[PDB]
Short mmCIF file of C-alpha atoms in Angstrom, two decimals:
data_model
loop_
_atom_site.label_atom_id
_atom_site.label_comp_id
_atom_site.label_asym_id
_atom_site.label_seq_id
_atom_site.Cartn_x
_atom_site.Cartn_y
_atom_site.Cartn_z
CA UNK A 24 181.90 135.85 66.69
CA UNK A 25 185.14 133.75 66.26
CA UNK A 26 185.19 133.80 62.42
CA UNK A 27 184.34 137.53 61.26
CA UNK A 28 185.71 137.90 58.71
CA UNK A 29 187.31 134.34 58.52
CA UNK A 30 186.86 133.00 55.26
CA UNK A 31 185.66 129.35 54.37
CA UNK A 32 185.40 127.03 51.69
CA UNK A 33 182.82 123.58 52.35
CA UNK A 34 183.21 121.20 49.01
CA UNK A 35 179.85 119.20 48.16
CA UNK A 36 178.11 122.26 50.27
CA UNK A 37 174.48 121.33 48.18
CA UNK A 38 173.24 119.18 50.66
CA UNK A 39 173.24 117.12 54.07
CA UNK A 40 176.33 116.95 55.96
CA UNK A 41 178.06 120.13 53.97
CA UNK A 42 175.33 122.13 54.78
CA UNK A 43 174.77 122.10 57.82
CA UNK A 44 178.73 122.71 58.28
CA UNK A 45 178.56 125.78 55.49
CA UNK A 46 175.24 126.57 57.56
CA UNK A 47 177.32 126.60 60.66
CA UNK A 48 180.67 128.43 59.65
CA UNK A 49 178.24 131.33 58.30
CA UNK A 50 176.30 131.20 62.24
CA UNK A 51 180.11 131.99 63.74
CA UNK A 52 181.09 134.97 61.22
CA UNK A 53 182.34 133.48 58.95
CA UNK A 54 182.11 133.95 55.05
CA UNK A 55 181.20 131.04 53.54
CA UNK A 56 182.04 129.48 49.91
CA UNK A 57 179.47 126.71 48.75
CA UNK A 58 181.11 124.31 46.10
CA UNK A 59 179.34 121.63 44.54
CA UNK A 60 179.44 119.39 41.58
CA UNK A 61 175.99 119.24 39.83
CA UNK A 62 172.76 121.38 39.98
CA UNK A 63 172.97 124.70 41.72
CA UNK A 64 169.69 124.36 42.82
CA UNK A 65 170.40 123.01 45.97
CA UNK A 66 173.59 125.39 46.49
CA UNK A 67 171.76 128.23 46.21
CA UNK A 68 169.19 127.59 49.02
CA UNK A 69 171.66 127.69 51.32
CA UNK A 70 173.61 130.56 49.60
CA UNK A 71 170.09 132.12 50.10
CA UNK A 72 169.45 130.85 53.52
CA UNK A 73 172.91 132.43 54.87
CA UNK A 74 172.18 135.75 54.24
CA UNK A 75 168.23 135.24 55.58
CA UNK A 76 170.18 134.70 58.62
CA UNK A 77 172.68 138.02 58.28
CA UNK A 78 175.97 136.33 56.77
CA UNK A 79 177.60 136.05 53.94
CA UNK A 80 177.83 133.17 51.47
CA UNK A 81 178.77 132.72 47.03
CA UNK A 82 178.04 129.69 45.21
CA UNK A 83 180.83 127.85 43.00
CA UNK A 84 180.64 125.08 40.04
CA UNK A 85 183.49 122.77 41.01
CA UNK A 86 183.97 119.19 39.85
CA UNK A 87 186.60 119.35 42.88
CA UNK A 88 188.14 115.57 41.20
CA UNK A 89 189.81 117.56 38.04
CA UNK A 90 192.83 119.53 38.35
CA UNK A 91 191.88 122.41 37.09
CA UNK A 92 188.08 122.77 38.07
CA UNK A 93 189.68 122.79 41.82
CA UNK A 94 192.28 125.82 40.30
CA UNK A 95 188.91 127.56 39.10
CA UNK A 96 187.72 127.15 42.57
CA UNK A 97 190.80 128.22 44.56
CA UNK A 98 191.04 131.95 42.10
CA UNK A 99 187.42 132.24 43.01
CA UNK A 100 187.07 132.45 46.32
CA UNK A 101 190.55 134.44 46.20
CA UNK A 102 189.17 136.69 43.79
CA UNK A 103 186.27 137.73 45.59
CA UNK A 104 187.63 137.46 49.06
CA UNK A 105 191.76 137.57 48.83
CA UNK A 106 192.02 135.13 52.21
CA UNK A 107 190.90 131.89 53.38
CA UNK A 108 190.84 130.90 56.91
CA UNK A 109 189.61 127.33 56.96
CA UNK A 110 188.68 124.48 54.06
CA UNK A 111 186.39 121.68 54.83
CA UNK A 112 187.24 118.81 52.43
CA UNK A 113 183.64 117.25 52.22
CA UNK A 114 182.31 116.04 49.25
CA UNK A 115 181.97 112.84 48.31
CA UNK A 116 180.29 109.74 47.15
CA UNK A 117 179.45 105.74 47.11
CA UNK A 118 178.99 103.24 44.80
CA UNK A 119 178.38 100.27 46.88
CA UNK A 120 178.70 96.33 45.93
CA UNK A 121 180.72 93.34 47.44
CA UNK A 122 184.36 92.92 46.09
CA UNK A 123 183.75 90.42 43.35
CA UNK A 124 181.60 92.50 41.63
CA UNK A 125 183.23 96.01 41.95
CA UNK A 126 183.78 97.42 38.51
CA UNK A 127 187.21 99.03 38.05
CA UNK A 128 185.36 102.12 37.08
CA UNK A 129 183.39 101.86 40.55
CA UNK A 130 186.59 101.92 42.64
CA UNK A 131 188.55 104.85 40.24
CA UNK A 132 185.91 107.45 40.57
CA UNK A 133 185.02 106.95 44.17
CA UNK A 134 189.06 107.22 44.65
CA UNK A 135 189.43 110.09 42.58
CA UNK A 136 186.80 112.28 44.15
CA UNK A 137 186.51 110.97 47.82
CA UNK A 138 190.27 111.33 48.16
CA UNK A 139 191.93 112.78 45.20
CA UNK A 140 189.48 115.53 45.90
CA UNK A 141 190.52 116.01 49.04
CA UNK A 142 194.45 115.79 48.24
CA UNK A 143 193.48 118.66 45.16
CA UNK A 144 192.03 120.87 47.55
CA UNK A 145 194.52 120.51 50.21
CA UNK A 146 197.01 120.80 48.03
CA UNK A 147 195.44 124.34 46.91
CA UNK A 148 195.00 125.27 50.53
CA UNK A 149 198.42 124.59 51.56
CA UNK A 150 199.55 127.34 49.40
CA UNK A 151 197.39 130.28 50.25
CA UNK A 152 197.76 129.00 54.31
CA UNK A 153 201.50 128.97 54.06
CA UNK A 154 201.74 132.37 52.98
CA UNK A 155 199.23 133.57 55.30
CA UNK A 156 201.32 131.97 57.86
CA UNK A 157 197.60 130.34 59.17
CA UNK A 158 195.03 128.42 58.77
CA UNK A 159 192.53 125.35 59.05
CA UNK A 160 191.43 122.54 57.51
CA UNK A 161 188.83 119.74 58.50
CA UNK A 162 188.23 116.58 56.43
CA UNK A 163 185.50 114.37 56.88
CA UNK A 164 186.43 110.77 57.08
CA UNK A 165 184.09 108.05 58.18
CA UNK A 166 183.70 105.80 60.61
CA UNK A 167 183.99 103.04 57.79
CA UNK A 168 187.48 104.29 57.02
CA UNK A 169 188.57 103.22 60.49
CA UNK A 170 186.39 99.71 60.89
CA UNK A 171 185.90 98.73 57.28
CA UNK A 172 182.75 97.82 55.74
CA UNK A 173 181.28 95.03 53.75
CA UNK A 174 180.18 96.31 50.23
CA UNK A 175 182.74 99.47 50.64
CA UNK A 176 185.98 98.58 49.39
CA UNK A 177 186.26 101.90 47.42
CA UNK A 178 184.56 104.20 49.84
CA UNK A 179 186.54 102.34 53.20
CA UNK A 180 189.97 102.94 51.32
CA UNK A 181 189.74 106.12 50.35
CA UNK A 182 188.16 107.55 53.87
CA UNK A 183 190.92 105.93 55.48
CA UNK A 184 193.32 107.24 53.00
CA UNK A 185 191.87 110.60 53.59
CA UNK A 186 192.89 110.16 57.57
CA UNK A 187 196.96 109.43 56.80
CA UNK A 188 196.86 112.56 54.13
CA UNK A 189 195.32 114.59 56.40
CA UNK A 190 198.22 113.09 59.42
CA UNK A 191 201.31 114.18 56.96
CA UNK A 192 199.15 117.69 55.90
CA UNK A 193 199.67 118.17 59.56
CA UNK A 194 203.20 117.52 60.03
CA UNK A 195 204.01 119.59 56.89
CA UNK A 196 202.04 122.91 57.49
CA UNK A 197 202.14 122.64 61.67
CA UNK A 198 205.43 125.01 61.94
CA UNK A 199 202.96 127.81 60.64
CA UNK A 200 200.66 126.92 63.30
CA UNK A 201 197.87 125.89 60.70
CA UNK A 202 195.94 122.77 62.02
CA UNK A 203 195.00 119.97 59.86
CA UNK A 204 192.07 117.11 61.11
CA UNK A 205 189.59 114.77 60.38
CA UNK A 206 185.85 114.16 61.41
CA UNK A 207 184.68 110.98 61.37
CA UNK A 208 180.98 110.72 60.88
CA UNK A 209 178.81 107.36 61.92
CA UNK A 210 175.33 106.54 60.86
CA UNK A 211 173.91 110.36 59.84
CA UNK A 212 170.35 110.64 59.53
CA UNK A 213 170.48 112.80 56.97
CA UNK A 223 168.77 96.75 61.74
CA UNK A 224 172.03 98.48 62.88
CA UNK A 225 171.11 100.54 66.06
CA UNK A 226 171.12 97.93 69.02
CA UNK A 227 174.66 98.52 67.44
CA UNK A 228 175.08 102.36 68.38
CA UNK A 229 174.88 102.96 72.02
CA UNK A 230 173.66 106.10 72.12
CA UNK A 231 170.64 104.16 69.94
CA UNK A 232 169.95 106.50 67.05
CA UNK A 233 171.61 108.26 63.83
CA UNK A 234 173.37 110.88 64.00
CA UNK A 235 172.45 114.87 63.10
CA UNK A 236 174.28 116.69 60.21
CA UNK A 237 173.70 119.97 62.83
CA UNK A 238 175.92 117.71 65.23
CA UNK A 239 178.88 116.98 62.81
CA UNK A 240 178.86 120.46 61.74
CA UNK A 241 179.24 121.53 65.48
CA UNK A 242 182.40 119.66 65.82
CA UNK A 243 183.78 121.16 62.42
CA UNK A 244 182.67 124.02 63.94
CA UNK A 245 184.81 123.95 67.02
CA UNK A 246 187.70 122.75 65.20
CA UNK A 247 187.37 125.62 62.84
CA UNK A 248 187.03 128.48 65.28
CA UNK A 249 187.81 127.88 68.68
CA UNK A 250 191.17 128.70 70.58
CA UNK A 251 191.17 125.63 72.37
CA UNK A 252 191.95 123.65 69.12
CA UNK A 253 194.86 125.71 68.02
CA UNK A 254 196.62 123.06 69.33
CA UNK A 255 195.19 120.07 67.97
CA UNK A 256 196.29 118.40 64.76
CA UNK A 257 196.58 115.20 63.22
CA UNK A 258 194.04 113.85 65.20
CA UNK A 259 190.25 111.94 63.99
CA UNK A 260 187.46 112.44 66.31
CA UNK A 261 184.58 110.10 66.11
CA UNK A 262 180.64 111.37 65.89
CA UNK A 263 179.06 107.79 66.03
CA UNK A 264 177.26 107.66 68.82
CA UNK A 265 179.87 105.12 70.37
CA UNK A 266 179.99 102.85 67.18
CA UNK A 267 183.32 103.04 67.21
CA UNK A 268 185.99 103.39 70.07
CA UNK A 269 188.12 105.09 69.63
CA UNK B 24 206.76 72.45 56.00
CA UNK B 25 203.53 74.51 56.75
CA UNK B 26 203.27 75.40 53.17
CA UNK B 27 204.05 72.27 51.18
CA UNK B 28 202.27 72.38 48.11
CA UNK B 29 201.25 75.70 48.69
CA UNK B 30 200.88 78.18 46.51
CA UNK B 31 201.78 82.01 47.16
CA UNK B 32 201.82 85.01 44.92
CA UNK B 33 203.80 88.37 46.04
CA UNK B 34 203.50 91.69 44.20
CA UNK B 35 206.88 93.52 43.86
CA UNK B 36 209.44 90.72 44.77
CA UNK B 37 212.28 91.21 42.95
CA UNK B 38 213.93 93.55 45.52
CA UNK B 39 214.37 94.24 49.41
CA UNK B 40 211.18 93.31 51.25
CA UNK B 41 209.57 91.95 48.48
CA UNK B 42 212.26 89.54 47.60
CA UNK B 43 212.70 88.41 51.67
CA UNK B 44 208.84 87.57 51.31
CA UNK B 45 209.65 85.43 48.14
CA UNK B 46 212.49 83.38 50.01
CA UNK B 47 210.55 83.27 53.40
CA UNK B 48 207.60 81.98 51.92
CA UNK B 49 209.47 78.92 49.76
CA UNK B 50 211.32 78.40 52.96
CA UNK B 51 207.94 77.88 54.42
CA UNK B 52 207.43 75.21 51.60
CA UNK B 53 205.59 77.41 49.40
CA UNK B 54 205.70 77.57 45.55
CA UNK B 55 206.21 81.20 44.62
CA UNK B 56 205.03 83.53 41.81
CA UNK B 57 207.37 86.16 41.87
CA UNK B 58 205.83 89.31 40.57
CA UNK B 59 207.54 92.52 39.23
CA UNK B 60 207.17 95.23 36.72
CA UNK B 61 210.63 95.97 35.60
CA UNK B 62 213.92 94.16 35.34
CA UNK B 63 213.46 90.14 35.20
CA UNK B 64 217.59 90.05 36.37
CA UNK B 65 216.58 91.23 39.59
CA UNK B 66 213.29 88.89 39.41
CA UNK B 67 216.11 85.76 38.30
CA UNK B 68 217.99 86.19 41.10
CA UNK B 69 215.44 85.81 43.62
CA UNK B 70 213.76 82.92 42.07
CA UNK B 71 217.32 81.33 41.38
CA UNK B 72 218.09 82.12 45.48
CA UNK B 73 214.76 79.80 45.78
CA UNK B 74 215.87 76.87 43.78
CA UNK B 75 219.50 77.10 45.60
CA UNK B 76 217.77 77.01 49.02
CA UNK B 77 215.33 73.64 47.26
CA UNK B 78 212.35 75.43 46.52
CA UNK B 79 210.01 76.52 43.73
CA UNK B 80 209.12 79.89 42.05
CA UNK B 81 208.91 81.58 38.72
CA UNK B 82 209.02 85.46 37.52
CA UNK B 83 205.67 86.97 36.54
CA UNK B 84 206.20 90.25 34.80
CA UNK B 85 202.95 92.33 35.29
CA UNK B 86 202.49 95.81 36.29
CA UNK B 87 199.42 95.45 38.91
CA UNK B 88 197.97 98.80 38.23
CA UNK B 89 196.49 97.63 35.09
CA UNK B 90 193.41 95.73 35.15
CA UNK B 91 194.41 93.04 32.49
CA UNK B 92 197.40 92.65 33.82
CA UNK B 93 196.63 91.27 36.90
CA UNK B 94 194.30 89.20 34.65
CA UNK B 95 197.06 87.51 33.15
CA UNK B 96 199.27 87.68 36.47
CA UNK B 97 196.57 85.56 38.02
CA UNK B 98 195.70 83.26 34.65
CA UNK B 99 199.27 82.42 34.88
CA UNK B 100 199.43 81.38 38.90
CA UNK B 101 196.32 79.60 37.89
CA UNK B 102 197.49 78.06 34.65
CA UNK B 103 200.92 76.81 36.18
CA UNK B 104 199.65 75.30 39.30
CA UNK B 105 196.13 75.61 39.52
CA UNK B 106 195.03 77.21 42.68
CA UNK B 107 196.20 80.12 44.58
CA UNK B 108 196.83 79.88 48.46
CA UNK B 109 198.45 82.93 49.65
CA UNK B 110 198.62 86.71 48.20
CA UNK B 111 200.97 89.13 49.10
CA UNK B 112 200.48 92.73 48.21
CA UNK B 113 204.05 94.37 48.39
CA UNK B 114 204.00 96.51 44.79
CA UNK B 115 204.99 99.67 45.73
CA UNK B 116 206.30 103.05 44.41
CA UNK B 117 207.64 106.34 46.30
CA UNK B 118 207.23 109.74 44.65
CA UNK B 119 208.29 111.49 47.56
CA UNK B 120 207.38 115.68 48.11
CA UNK B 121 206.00 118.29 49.90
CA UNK B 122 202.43 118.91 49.13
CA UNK B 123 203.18 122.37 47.98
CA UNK B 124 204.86 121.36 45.51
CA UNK B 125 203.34 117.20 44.49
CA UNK B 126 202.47 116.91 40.57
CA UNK B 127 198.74 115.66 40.16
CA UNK B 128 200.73 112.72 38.38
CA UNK B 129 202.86 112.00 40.74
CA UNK B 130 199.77 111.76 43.13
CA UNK B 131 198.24 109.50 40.53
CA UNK B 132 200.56 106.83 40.13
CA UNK B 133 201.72 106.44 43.52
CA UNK B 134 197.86 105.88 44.65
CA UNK B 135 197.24 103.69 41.51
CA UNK B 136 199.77 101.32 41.81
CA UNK B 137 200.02 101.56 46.15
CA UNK B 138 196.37 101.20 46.50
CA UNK B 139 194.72 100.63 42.97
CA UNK B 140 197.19 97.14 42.71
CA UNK B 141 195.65 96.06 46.40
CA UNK B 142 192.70 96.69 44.79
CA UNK B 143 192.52 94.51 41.51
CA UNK B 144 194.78 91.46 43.33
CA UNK B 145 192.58 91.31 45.81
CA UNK B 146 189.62 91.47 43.53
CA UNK B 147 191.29 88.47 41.46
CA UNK B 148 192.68 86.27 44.26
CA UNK B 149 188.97 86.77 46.22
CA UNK B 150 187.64 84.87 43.38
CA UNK B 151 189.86 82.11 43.73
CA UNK B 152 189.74 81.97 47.10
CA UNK B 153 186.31 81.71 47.63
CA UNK B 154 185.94 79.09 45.54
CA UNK B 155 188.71 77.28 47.54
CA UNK B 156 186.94 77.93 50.68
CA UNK B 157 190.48 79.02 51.75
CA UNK B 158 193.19 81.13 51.23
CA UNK B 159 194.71 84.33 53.31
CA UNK B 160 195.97 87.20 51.80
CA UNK B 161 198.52 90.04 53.31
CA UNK B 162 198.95 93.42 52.28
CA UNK B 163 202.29 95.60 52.76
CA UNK B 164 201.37 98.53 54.40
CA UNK B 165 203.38 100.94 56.66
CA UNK B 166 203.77 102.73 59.78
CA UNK B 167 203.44 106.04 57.77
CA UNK B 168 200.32 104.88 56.76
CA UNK B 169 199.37 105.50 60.67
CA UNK B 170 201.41 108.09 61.61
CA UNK B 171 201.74 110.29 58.47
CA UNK B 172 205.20 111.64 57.26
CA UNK B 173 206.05 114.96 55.65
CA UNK B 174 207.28 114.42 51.81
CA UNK B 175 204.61 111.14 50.99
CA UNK B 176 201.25 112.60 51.51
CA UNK B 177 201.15 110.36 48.37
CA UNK B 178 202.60 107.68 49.93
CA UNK B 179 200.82 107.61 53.34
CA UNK B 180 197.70 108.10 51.76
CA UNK B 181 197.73 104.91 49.84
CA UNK B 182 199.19 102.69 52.65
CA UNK B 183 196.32 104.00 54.89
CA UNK B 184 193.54 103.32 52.39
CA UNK B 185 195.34 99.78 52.14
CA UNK B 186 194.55 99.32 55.70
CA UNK B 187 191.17 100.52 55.26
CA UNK B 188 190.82 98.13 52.52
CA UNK B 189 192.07 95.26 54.48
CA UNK B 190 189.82 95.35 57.07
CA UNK B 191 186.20 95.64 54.19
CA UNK B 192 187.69 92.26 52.53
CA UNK B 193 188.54 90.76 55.71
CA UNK B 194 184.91 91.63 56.46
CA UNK B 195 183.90 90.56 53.17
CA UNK B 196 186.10 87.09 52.88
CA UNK B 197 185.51 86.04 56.39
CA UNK B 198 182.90 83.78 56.66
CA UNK B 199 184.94 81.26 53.86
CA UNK B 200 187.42 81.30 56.66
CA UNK B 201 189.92 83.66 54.34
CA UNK B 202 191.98 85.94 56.84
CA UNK B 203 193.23 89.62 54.61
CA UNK B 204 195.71 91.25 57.16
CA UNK B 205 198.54 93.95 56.95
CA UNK B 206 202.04 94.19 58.03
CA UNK B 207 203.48 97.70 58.83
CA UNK B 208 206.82 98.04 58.33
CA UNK B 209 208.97 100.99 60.18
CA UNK B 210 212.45 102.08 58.57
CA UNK B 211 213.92 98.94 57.19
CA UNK B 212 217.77 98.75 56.21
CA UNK B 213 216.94 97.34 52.23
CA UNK B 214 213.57 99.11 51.93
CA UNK B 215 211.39 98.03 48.81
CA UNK B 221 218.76 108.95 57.87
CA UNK B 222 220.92 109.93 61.01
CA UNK B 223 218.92 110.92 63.73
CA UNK B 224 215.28 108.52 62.62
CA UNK B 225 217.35 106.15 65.53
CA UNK B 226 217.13 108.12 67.88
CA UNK B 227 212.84 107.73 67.56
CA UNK B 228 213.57 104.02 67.23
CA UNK B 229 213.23 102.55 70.95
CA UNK B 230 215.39 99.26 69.60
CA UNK B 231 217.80 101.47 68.08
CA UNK B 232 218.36 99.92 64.58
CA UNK B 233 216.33 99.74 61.17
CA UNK B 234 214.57 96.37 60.99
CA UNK B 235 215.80 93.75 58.56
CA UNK B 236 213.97 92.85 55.57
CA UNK B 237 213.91 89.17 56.58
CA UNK B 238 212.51 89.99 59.76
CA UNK B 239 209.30 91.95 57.92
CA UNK B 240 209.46 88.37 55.96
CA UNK B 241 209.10 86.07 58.88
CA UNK B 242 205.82 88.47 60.15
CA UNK B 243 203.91 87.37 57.20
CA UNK B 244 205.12 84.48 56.95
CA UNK B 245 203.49 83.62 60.00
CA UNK B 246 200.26 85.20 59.00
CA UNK B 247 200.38 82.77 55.61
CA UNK B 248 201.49 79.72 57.27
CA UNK B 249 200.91 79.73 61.38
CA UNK B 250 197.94 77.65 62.01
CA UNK B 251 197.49 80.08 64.84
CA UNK B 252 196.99 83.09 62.16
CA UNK B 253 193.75 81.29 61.27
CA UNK B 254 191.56 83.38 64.32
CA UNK B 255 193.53 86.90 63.37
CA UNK B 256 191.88 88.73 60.54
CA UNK B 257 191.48 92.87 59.76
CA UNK B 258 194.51 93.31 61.93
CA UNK B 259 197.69 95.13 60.99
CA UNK B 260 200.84 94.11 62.80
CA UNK B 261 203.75 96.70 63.00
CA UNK B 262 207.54 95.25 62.95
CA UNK B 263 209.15 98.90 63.44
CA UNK B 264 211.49 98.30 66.56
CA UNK B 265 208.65 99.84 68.52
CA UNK B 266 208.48 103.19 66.41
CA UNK B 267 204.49 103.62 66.68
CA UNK B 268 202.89 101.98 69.93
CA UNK B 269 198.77 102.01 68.82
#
């Protein structure tokens, strides 16, 4: 099993798309850290729900947007563990209208987390996976990042900001051999359609299996900087 | 001239690219708002180059990451000459360090003013523009928004979500016939070493005028009027798609 005892941290973990992935890291070894922002509730299921299955997973409060909540998160996982493998920058949110009426407040927040969660965390990661001399990391992007979307100003710019951080993460940390990518979800299931070729949504068990093989498998030691697309076609490439 | 009686607005022209912009565009027959956030000697000079060369401009101080700012950036435009026909988004800052070592701060106001200022001009000149049923508006970008570069994960990060940004509002402006587009620029000789020629296939940093006549031709070109969500690199062939 690729990741025993690789250790991995999933942001906004609770529900959807971050569980499956936390869901799927445990399935491959691995010991999994389950951030999220709000109510536990939902964390804890799948805390619960990894060891049902024989693994190994610890919840975390993180608002991963502030500073120091990500600081809180990063002794955590080093305090029970001392080690992490690979760090799935993953949480996120929307607040969607059309540009005229986009509160200030509606862009900032959706920036701060979306993205300046994802620099935070990164920048946390970096220095653990530096002095390991290894490591991974896998942030989801969106489709909408690459195509832009009407009503998404705030959600389109930071998903594509979130694909050129995660290109220079790459060039910086790649002489240690840690990679650093991006999945780009489409439609998830967790009126458009005649749109996607494939014809349907997508499954948060199928974006998780990509993470996945980024995360663990030999044949992507060598791939970095890089975006791959789980759209069913929407976009190409 | 394509531009007569035109009005454009740039972000950050006192200096380098910024400035080229300025005197392109009033070469083009546009009036120009010079923007800037600092010294107005540097924002004199280019609007005095403009009135040698028998154009029009004035200096705007505002500093585009504040929201009422921009308000009064864009009152003003308004206020002087009453309709707004071109925006260019140049404003820019470099904080420039590993991420091991970037401050949350410098983070912050490298993505505020980068990204956050593409943001709120865009958000002001939309509602001008749609009432105009016209207008086309360019952002400043950057190849290292595409291609990443080690020491601006700050910096990269904010030209990319630029170009993510351009393409929702060209979505967004496109049926009033308003085009939103980016230039990237590669390693220009002004800006605003050694061996980065060697990665150049044309063997020279790009002038700061030539990054000026791109979007000049975006503003002005009545063929420009069909291209919209696009971003254009003028890098001497330093990123090919």
């Amino acid at each position: 099993l690729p990741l025993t005892d690789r250790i991995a941290l999933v942001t906004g973990a609770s529900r959807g798309i971050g569980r499956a992935i936390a869901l799927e890291l445990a399935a491959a070894g691995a010991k999994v850290a389950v951030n999220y922002a709000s109510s536990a509730g939902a964390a804890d299921e799948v805390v619960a729900a990894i060891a049902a299955a024989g693994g190994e997973a610890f919840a975390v409060k993180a608002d991963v947007s502030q500073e120091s909540e990500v600081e809180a998160l990063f002794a955590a996982v080093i305090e029970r563990w001392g080690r992490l493998d690979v760090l799935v920058n993953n949480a996120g949110i929307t607040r969607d209208t059309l540009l005229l009426r986009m509160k200030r407040d509606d862009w900032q927040s959706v920036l701060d987390l979306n993205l300046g969660g994802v620099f935070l965390c990164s920048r946390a990661a970096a220095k653990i996976m530096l002095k390991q001399r290894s490591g991974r990391i896998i942030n989801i992007a969106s489709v909408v990042g690459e195509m832009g979307n009407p009503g998404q100003a705030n959600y389109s710019a930071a998903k594509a900001g979130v694909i050129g951080l995660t290109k220079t993460v790459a060039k910086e940390l790649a002489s240690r051999g840690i990679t650093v990518n991006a999945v780009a979800p489409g439609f998830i299931a967790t009126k458009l359609l005649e749109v996607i070729p494939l014809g349907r949504y997508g499954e948060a068990a199928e974006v998780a299996g990509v993470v996945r093989f980024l995360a663990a498998d030999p044949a992507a030691a060598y791939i970095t900087g890089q975006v791959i697309n789980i759209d069913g076609g929407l976009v190409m490439a």
